[PDB]
Design a protein around this ligand. Sequence first.
Ligand SMILES: Nc1nc2c(ncn2[C@@H]2O[C@H](COP(=O)(O)OP(=O)(O)O)[C@@H](O)[C@H]2O)c(=O)[nH]1
Ligand SMILES: [Mg+2]
Ligand SMILES: [Zn+2]
Lengths: 202, 27
Amino acid sequence: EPQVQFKLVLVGDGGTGKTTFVKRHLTGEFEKKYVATLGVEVHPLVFHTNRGPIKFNVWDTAGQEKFGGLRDGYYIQAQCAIIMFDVTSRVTYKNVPNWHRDLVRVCENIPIVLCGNKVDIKDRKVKAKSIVFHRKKNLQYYDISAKSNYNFEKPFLWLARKLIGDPNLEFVAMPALAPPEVVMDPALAAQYEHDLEVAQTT
Amino acid sequence: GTWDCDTCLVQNKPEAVKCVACETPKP
Ligand SMILES: Nc1nc2c(ncn2[C@@H]2O[C@H](COP(=O)(O)OP(=O)(O)O)[C@@H](O)[C@H]2O)c(=O)[nH]1
Ligand SMILES: [Mg+2]
Ligand SMILES: [Zn+2]
């Protein structure tokens, strides 16, 4: 059996929670591969779908994004991407278009999910109404909270459906994730999800 | 045919003698 796997690049401003996010997947963390030349840790994240396992090889930087764009080698052969920002830091949202631009320059029209991280933090700065870059670009958006595992599987499920070309692909079980370090208030999640729905009707 | 880089997991062209992404030589 030929294994189904995709290079996923995980980009966004430093401090947005990319590493925290990718690390939730325990096996992906244990089996991560260090790429010395590029200063990348590739986390092989397997998800079990109704059509068998799929593996996202997630490329997590070693913080270099704080000092400039990433090198071509980081992006090359990427098959999908997550662009992350921090909903408590508007500037990270403002930089989202730049990340998308750098990404598409090397990778063209690969499937990309936009993720607004740290929604567990009560004082949210970038709210649903303001989040529109994905609309302008054919991208899917999700709120996430890396620290609580909130919506962890969402970006990967959406990407898997796009990559495999199966709108009915499902994850049959969640991968083993690091136990939440903060609680994501369910009422707050419900509100945020509602706010996003409302926003999509504008 | 194509080969997978053992360092970074990128799939490379049959004619590549080193990984297009991370430069690791093909084993
Ligand atoms: N409250 C909260 N903090 C987070 C979350 N994700 C990351 N952080 C914090 O944000 C800071 C930067 O996270 P990091 O994963 O290193 O971001 P990166 O530079 O994009 O890889 C760290 O202090 C994390 O603990 C989250 O979902 N919720
Ligand atoms: Mg990081
Ligand atoms: Zn390589």
